[PDB]
Amino acid sequence: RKKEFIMAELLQTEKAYVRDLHECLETYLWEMTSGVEEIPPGILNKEHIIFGNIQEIYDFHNNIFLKELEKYEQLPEDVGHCFVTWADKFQMYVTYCKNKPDSNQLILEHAGTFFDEIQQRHGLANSISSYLIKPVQRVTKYQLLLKELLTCCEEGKGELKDGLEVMLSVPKKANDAMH
Amino acid sequence: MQAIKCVVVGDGAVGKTCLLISYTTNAFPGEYIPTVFDNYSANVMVDGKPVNLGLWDTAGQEDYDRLRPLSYPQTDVFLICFSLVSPASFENVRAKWYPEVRHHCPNTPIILVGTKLDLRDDKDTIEKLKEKKLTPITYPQGLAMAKEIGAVKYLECSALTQRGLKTVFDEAIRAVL
Ligand SMILES: Nc1nc2c(ncn2[C@@H]2O[C@H](COP(=O)(O)OP(=O)(O)O)[C@@H](O)[C@H]2O)c(=O)[nH]1
């Protein structure tokens, strides 16, 4: 019963994550690039610093990873393998974390109320800062869920262990890349 | 409307995620304790004043010292948490959490929170600590630690029974108003 609860939370929070990144891209980002409003010269044309590679991270989870996790729904003891298979893709998070301080610093110094105004007009409960922290949260959450599965899976602990090893290495490498 | 960003920090398994779930849903999650608490916002009334309270969890980041501070900029108030039946989590308030929070956020108020209050008088818990030559953290230890780190309040609570739970978040808002 417990492993079914863990797998259900993995899938539900994955869907929520994809939805959140989608909302960030189609609101806060679309406003900068649409050419529909007025952007401060301090951030004009600097969307790649503000958002990093969050487009690429979204494409991976939307196009590939949520669909592959879904295929593991009735195979929770094997889901560690999903992370082994797509290990290379998670390297994008290293690039994302490295850039995060510059993003925050640029928004604070030159963005003014531009993104706050955008939030009000769309009635979003989450600020741009609340959205941009989510990849940092997500890449450190997968290891917790894999550890939980290890407490209640007899077979096959082997598959889970290899997956966990991957999802400890990725955030460690991202951590060690910070200046 | 006044907006408030509150970040919850502290050792693994001091019950950060439980604290947040129990508060926002008004019930301990007994059937299954979720691993994930997504960033939360809600209008709340405190002393006739309307406020929007934002809550961010940090569970899962305890081992990544350079990733953790990415959540800290523009925080209005911190809850630094330890479990009342884990002396190691209490010492880490001084060794780990206060130093990094104050380094990144020099002017931001801190509330020191002791969690799992329901276990302090639990026979089996006490006995297991005894086997390790330890005892639970009592109120005057909490007060002393808060004075050391310059916390504006020390508060004890239980996510399980909800005793003291609403008061923690009321006082976090009062630290900012
Ligand atoms: N007795 C008791 N147990 C609690 C309380 N809060 C959390 N726990 C337990 O402590 C463990 C860790 O809780 P969690 O919220 O996951 O801690 P986190 O790792 O800091 O997020 C879980 O097994 C909870 O059941 C409490 O108020 N009373």
Domain boundaries, chain B: 1-177
- CA-to-CA distance for B147 and B153, rounded, in angstroms? 9
Nearest C-alpha in B relative to A172 = B64
Backbone angles phi, psi at B50, to 5 degrees: -80, 130
**Are the Cβ atoms of A129 and B54 closer than 8 angstroms?**
no
| Chain A positions in Cβ-Cβ contact with residue B66 (cut-off 8 Å) | 175-176, 178
Query: Helices (H) and strands (E) in chain A — how many of each?
Result: 12, 0
The top-level CATH class assigned to A1-179 is mainly alpha
Name the CA radius of gyration of chain B, rounded: 16
Query: Does the CB atom of residue B17 touch ligand 1 within 6 A?
Result: yes
- CA-to-CA distance for A72 and A59, rounded, in angstroms? 20
Instruction: Report which of A139, A133, A145 is spatially closest to residue A171, judged by C-alpha positions.
Output: A139
Q: Was B160 annotated as part of a binding site?
A: yes
Amino acid in position B31:
E
- B125-129 own/partner pairs: CB under 8 Å, 24+ apart: B125/B85, B129/B85, B129/B87
Tell which one of B7, B14, B18, B25 to mutate to probe ligand 1, the residue whose CB is within 8 A of the most ligand atoms: B18
Resolution, expressed in angstroms to one decimal = 1.6
| Backbone region of residue B8 per phi and psi (left: phi > 0; alpha: psi in -120 to 50; beta: other values) | beta
| Chain B positions in Cβ-Cβ contact with residue A5 (cut-off 8 Å) | 32
SS3 assignment, position B43: strand
Residue with tokens 């298979």: A85
Residue with tokens 């262990």: A161
| Backbone region of residue B27 per phi and psi (left: phi > 0; alpha: psi in -120 to 50; beta: other values) | beta
Backbone angles phi, psi at B118, to 5 degrees: -60, -20
For the CA of B119, the nearest atom of ligand 1: 1
By Cβ distance, the residue of A9, A16, A101 closest to B35 is: A9
CA distances (Å), origin A66, targets A63, A136, A144, B155: 7, 18, 18, 41
DSSP characters for B50-102? EEEEEEE--TT-TT-TTTGGGG-TT-SEEEEEEETT-HHHHHHIIIIIHHHHH
Contact B153, B146 (CB under 8 A): yes
Contact B114, B155 (CB under 8 A): yes
Q: Is the peptide bond before B60 cis (omega within 30 degrees of 0)?
A: no
Amino acid in position A128:
I
* CATH 3.40.50.300 describes domain B1-177: yes
